[PDB]
Amino acid sequence: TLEEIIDDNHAIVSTSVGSEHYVSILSFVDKDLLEPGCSVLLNHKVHAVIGVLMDDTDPLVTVMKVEKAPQETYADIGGLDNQIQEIKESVELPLTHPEYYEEMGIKPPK
Amino acid sequence: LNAKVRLLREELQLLQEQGSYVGEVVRAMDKKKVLVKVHPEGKFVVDVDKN
């Protein structure tokens, strides 16, 4: 792991190996894809950067499912109609219409 | 009878060796590399064999 990014062509690295060697980076991988605290590949005796590691873990945050386009629609409930227009105007409507937000100059509610 | 004797003299020669680490493969990657976590040790990317 890259500890921290020292911009004057340096960086802090913690090695669990032993040796470290200050090298010039390859041209496939850049420092713009290096972030502080990132995992990177080092050799075991010339300790140089082949590439950054591309294997990242599970979002560890509190219970979440992400879903693109769920099955259900709002045509099944009925007689509730007014409430349904309220969310409509706020959320759905700016996506549908750029320029209606431009005329007014404001955002629909967050 | 002769074949078996030849098997024995061979065996003495080979035995001076150096072993292999046990690991567990976390996941395979298409660089034809594997990421492995070795048990008292660290994790490495290693290049698959021929077979």
Residue whose structure tokens are 């490495």: B44
At A90 the three-state DSSP class reads helix
User: A18: which 2 tokens?
Assistant: 């032993």
Closest chain A residue by Cα to residue B43:
A41
Note the resolution in Å, 1 decimal. 6.8
**Residue A36 C-alpha, separation from nearest chain B C-alpha, in angstroms:** 20
Query: Considering only CB atoms, which chain B residues are within 8 Å of A18?
Result: none
Residue A97, classified by CB atoms within 10 Å of its CB into exposed (0-12), middle (13-18) or buried (19+), is exposed
Query: Considering only CB atoms, which chain A residues are within 8 Å of B29?
Result: 54-55
Distance CA A32, CA B11 (A): 56
According to the entry, how was the structure determined? cryo-EM
Query: Considering only CB atoms, which chain B residues are within 8 Å of A52?
Result: none
Distance CA A34, CA A13 (A): 12
What are the contacts of B40-44 at 24+ separation with CB within 8 A? Answer: B42/A16
Residue whose structure tokens are 């470290």: A20
DSSP code for A92: I
